Amino acid sequence: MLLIFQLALFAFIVVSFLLVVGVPVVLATPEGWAENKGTVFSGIGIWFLLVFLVGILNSFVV
């Protein structure tokens, strides 16, 4: 269970880094926000799912 929790935390970190790097780039291009909305929405959803999963799994490793 500990390994799964650490893998989830690492996935959360890498998803957060990808979002931080990419969201300003997508938002700051001409006619890029109006087209690549789905990728940003899916990234935000995955970020929220990962944070909820990490919060749930923290109760067993602590």
């Binding site: 790097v21 780039v25 700051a28 291009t29 001409p30 890029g32």
Partner: protein, 33 residues
């Protein structure tokens, strides 16, 4: 050269490189800066 110090330096490099990366990406592709 401790492993912990190497990891801290790697994390610092990753965090610092995330700032001008956005500027470089937006300037190279002609974004709205």
């Amino acid at each position: 050269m401790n492993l912990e110090i190497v990891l801290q330096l790697t994390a610092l490099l990753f965090i610092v490189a995330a700032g001008p990366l956005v500027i470089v990406l937006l300037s190279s592709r002609g974004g709205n800066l």
